[PDB]
Amino acid sequence: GAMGITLFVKAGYDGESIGNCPFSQRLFMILWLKGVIFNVTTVDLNLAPGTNPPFMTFDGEVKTDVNKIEEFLEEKLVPPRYPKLGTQHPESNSAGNDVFAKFSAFIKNTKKDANEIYEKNLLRALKKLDSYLNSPLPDEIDADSSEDVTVSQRKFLDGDELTLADCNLLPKLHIIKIVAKKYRDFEFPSEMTGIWRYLNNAYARDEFTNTCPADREIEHAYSDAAKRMK
């Protein structure tokens, strides 16, 4: 029978390479971090007609919905052969969960008179995430620091290891960073040092950097943001 895992992802514009999709990147990262053998098939145009292309076969069985695939992988790939990637702190699963939605409304808005509201809503969401990244978690200890630790030095959302929460959020933050810069000259504010520490830590991980689609894929996917504000 069909055995193993195949992840089907959106193809880029060349019809063969990885295209823009935060959901595909999320699953790519999970499978990488699991240490499981898998292949990635790009989709270039028993599964329903026109199902949206981030899906997976597991021993031949088709699995849909990015959230359900995550839950299935975390439940089927377990120690000792595969690590658990679930978070230890429940707040890690909700931190910044509105950021991508607010960015989407900001970047898709056409009316200039509404930009201040959408941009401020984005900044408010980012502030909340930055606060979580900079506030030490309760169990956090800096064993090597004689001084008191007021700004968290942990690498990622939940601690020093990448978890499912990072696989969800990091692809979205990567899109925001590329698109908002290209089309709005908008950047994560310099005072949000938690977001910037987090991104610097993440871009130093092969599992994040080498699952990012090319910048031009992401910029092309959002090419409608180059239109004038009416």
Count of all domains = 2
Q: What is the CA-atom radius of gyration, in angstroms?
A: 19 Å
Q: Number of helical segments?
A: 9
Spatial ordering of strands, largest sheet? 2-1-3-4
CATH class (first level) name of the largest domain:
Mainly Alpha
Reported by name, the CATH topology of the largest domain is Glutathione S-transferase Yfyf (Class Pi), Chain A, domain 2
Task: Give the terminus-to-terminus CA distance.
Answer: 56 Å
Largest sheet: 4 strands, mixed
CATH architecture of the largest domain: Up-down Bundle
User: What coarse outline follows from CA principal-axis ratios?
Assistant: flat
Classification by helices and strands: alpha+beta
Helix content: 40-55%
Please report the total strand number as a whole number: 4
Which sequence of SSEs, written as H and E, runs from N to C? Answer: EHEEEHHHHHHHH
What is the strand content? 5-15%
Family: Belongs to the chloride channel CLIC family.
Domain GST C-terminal: 59-230
Transmembrane segments: 23-43
Motif (G-site): 21-24
Summarize the structure.
The PDB classes it as transport protein. The chain is α+β, with helices and mostly antiparallel strands. It has helices at 22-34, 66-76, 91-94, 99-108, 115-134, 164-184, 193-203, 206-209, 215-221, and strands spanning 5-10, 38-43, 55-58, 61-63.
